[PDB]
Amino acid sequence: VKKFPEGFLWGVATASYQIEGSPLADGAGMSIWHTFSHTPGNVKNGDTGDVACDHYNRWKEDIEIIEKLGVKAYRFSISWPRILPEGTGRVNQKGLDFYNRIIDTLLEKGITPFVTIYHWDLPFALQLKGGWANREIADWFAEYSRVLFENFGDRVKNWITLNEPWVVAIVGHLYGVHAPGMRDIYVAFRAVHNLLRAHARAVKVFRETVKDGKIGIVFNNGYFEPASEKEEDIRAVRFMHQFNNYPLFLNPIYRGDYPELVLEFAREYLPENYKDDMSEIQEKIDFVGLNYYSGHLVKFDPDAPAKVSFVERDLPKTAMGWEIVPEGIYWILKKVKEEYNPPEVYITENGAAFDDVVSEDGRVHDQNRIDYLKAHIGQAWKAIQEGVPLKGYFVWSLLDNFEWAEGYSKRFGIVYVDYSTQKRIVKDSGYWYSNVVKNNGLE
Amino acid sequence: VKKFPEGFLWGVATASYQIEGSPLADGAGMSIWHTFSHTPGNVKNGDTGDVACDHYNRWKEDIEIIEKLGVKAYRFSISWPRILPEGTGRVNQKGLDFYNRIIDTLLEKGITPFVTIYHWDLPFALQLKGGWANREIADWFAEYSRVLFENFGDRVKNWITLNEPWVVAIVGHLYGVHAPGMRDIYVAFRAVHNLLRAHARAVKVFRETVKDGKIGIVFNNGYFEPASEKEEDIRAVRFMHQFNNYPLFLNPIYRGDYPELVLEFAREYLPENYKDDMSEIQEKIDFVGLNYYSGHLVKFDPDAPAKVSFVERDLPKTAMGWEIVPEGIYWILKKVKEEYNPPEVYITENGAAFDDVVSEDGRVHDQNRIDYLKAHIGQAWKAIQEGVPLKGYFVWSLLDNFEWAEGYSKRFGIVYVDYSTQKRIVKDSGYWYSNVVKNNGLE
Ligand SMILES: OC[C@H]1c2[nH]cnc2[C@H](O)[C@@H](O)[C@@H]1O
Numbered sequence: 034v035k036k037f038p039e040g041f042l043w044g045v046a047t048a049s050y051q052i053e054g055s056p057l058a059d060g061a062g063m064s065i066w067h068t069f070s071h072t073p074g075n076v077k078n079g080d081t082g083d084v085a086c087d088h089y090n091r092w093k094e095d096i097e098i099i100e101k102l103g104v105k106a107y108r109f110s111i112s113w114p115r116i117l118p119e120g121t122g123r124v125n126q127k128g129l130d131f132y133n134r135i136i137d138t139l140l141e142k143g144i145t146p147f148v149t150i151y152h153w154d155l156p157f158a159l160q161l162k163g164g165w166a167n168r169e170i171a172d173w174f175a176e177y178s179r180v181l182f183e184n185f186g187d188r189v190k191n192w193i194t195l196n197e198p199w200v201v202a203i204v205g206h207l208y209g210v211h212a213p214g215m216r217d218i219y220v221a222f223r224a225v226h227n228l229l230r231a232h233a234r235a236v237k238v239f240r241e242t243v244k245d246g247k248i249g250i251v252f253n254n255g256y257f258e259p260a261s262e263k264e265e266d267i268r269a270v271r272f273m274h275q276f277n278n279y280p281l282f283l284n285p286i287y288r289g290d291y292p293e294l295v296l297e298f299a300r301e302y303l304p305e306n307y308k309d310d311m312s313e314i315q316e317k318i319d320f321v322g323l324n325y326y327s328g329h330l331v332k333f334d335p336d337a338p339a340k341v342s343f344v345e346r347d348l349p350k351t352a353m354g355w356e357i358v359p360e361g362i363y364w365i366l367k368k369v370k371e372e373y374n375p376p377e378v379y380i381t382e383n384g385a386a387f388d389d390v391v392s393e394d395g396r397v398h399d400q401n402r403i404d405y406l407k408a409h410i411g412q413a414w415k416a417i418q419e420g421v422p423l424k425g426y427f428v429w430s431l432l433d434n435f436e437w438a439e440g441y442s443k444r445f446g447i448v449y450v451d452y453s454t455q456k457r458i459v460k461d462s463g464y465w466y467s468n469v470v471k472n473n474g475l476e
Numbered sequence: 477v478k479k480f481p482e483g484f485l486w487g488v489a490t491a492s493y494q495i496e497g498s499p500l501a502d503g504a505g506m507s508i509w510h511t512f513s514h515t516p517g518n519v520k521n522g523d524t525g526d527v528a529c530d531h532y533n534r535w536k537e538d539i540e541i542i543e544k545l546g547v548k549a550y551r552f553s554i555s556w557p558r559i560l561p562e563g564t565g566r567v568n569q570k571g572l573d574f575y576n577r578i579i580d581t582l583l584e585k586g587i588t589p590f591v592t593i594y595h596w597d598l599p600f601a602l603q604l605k606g607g608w609a610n611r612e613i614a615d616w617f618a619e620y621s622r623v624l625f626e627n628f629g630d631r632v633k634n635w636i637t638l639n640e641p642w643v644v645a646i647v648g649h650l651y652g653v654h655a656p657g658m659r660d661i662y663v664a665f666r667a668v669h670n671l672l673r674a675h676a677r678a679v680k681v682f683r684e685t686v687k688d689g690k691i692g693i694v695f696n697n698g699y700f701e702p703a704s705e706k707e708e709d710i711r712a713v714r715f716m717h718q719f720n721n722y723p724l725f726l727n728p729i730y731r732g733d734y735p736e737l738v739l740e741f742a743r744e745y746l747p748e749n750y751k752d753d754m755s756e757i758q759e760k761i762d763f764v765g766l767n768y769y770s771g772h773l774v775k776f777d778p779d780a781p782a783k784v785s786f787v788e789r790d791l792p793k794t795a796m797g798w799e800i801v802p803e804g805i806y807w808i809l810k811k812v813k814e815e816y817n818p819p820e821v822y823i824t825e826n827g828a829a830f831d832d833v834v835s836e837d838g839r840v841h842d843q844n845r846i847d848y849l850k851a852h853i854g855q856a857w858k859a860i861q862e863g864v865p866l867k868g869y870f871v872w873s874l875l876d877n878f879e880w881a882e883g884y885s886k887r888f889g890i891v892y893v894d895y896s897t898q899k900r901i902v903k904d905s906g907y908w909y910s911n912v913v914k915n916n917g918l919e
Pocket residue numbers: 491494639640696767769825872879880888
């Protein structure tokens with residue numbers, strides 16, 4: 034028996050471009066994911082977000098699902114180009130109306146909204162002006178964030194500025210695998226820095242406009258272990274933690290500079306006078322969100338672009354090929370407390386992709402996903418018993434959805450979506466979780 | 477005996493990033509090729525332009541080689557970020573000094589300068605603002621063009637706005653193979669359109685600042701043949717010529733719209749209201765520069781993104797793998813005259829790469845280059861006999877150099893460059909072309 038604290042927020046999470054469809058409905062502007070996915074070669078099977086789960090139409094049914102499961106919080110994101118179709122300037126009332134209905138409905142039903150301001154769907158109009166590479170995006174983002182705060186901050190009290198800024202910068206602008214699809218290391222590090230500046234401006238505006246709520250930021254994290262007892266493998270782990278995990282961003286926020294090994298690798302790629310922006314970057318935050326999915330074995334490697342390579346292990350893997358390592362969620366939670374001691378932490382995503390099928394009996398028997406979720410929830414509980422101020426846990430995802438460059442080929446939902454009909458079928462993992470939430474823990 | 481007209485201009489061509497090195501010397505700003513080539517994985521063997529042929533230091537010698545060969549014209553480019561390190565604003569006097577000495581030396585030796593304003597080295601500062609994706613670049617480019625015209629137009633009277641805008645837009649922003657290394661088709665077509673707009677602004681500034689000068693624009697061209705006499709393959713060739721060759725830009729400049737089959741493919745990717753800019757785009761030009769290297773055989777194919785695929789042929793190939801089809805230079809010259817009838821045409825680049833070796837003799841016996849060039853210059857002569865107003869021919873290139881994503885692995889020079897010592901060794905093609913210029917023709 035593992036009972037969580039009284040009032041612990043059990044949640045589910047989604048993102049706008051992944052679930053909504055109808056990207057150009059009701060006067061919305063194009064996003065960078067619209068243009069990226071519509072470019073041949075960028076997304077598996079030529080898939081796009083044009084339809085997705087059709088949540089733009091089916092949002093009431095989906096929230097009724099969350100309500101029927103008894104889940105207490107819903108993390109969702111707002112599409113910037115539905116709100117400001119050119120990124121700045123004109124506000125689109127029909128976009129505000131879409132999200133107003135969702136927010137009013139969740140509150141009617143007693144579900145706490147957690148709003149992600151940016152989950153990767155930058156307005157295309159801003160990408161034409163350099164997007165995250167342009168210092169002026171700190172102003173654009175702050176203006177966007179102020180619109181949201183002024184329209185929704187009377188009702189929404191839990192806000193997240195950025196989802197996984199490492200991904201946005203590095204996968205988007207170095208690896209070129211995500212929108213906007215660039216491969217330039219100097220751009221990617223300018224994006225890292227502008228992401229921090231934009232985050233901080235939005236937190237500054239939040240303090241002026243929503244006197245009652247809390248604001249934070251979300252990071253991707255892996256559990257890196259060293260391949261050997263060699264000092265060089267241990268240091269490769271230190272580097273991957275500092276670069277790929279929360280320290281890239283929390284070292285600036287809490288300490289006023291990038292982590293040491295990131296500076297060793299990337300000083301030449303940051304702006305020349307980047308320290309001039311650090312005092313502003315330290316704007317106080319209310320909580321940290323940590324996403325966690327996987328662990329990696331890591332070794333020093335002289336021929337790799339950052340002197341690190343991954344070493345495959347014969348461990349159970351998900352359909353993404355990602356190693357299942359539940360102790361990682363404990364470790365990152367312990368480690369964030371030890372390194373930065375944030376006042377609150379949330380697991381804002383944890384989940385798994387498996388090759389789900391609808392059985393003859395009408396059900397989806399995803400015991401593999403139950404097992405994954407139960408183990409990570411247990412490790413989260415552990416960290417709570419050892420003093421980490423974990424206030425909530427959000428499953429990625431409510432719904433099978435558009436998995437970015439993998440398209441529809443990877444199902445992370447606790448609810449199966451049959452894309453030919455848009456039918457929703459609650460998976461065994463969804464039923465299992467509803468019981469966890471009702472009991473406030475595991476048994 | 478193939479004699480060319482009186483005053484026919486015989487030339488050699490280079491580009492700034494490809495030969496200069498010292499990209500950050502003397503207060504120069506970074507270019508997108510510096511940042512792109514310093515990104516791992518973008519250029520073969522990790523080559524960069526940091527050093528190249530060290531023309532930044534060895535320029536006098538190189539011009540003396542042009543003199544010793546009696547070549548009458550030198551086509552070279554100006555590095556935008558040497559002149560305006562932030563793209564706009566402050567002029568770097570040292571960058572002005574560098575090209576002024578080159579310009580003064582050429583004139584003293586009676587070599588006619590053809591200056592390329594843009595040969596792909598955009599200032600990094602402007603890439604952070606969206607580069608060619610940003611409508612604003614028409615103003616940035618106009619400002620830059622003015623600085624060049626005001627400081628250099630007293631002596632340079634032959635100017636090219638853009639080298640190969642198809643490559644800049646499509647290879648830099650759709651294929652991601654060139655700087656800035658993006659893959660987004662909406663961005664790529666906005667870059668096509670902004671290239672035209674920036675070109676036209678520069679020509680308008682040129683008319684206000686240079687007395688008795690000529691200005692034109694350079695296009696890449698291939699000679700496309702159908703794989704069969706089937707209707708669909710003939711229509712595939714028509715699409716390739718309209719999109720990949722001069723019509724993409726010349727249809728706007730002479731007829732005030734893009735070609736029909738380009739619009740059938742790409743109307744959804746072009747900016748809203750693009751046709752509003754077409755009357756400005758028709759700013760009158762003085763010449764068309766055509767670059768020509770190779771031929772390709774193509775076929776219709778309902779699975780390729782543009783419904784077209786290339787098909788390999790068992791013909792003589794260069795070290796790049798490109799099929800040697802000299803009759804393509806005649807075809808492209810005849811076709812530009814029939815379709816657009818420009819008042820003057822130049823072959824602004826023609827050339828080949830072969831695995832060139834230095835022998836015990838300390839000479840390089842590149843018969844293969846001689847054969848390539850001789851065949852093309854003869855097809856150019858034939859075009860002149862059928863009334864094409866061809867005024868000059870430029871060999872790509874004077875020096876072996878940094879061949880973009882191929883790095884130093886591909887040698888196009890009529891002068892060999894030993895990168896270990898920076899030793900120039902004139903090749904036999906060099907001596908053979910020396911002859912051609914002397915005789916104003918072949919044999
Ligand atoms: O690849 C060889 C050359 C070429 N071929 C077609 N266009 C060009 C460019 O203008 C030039 O800089 C390249 O070095």
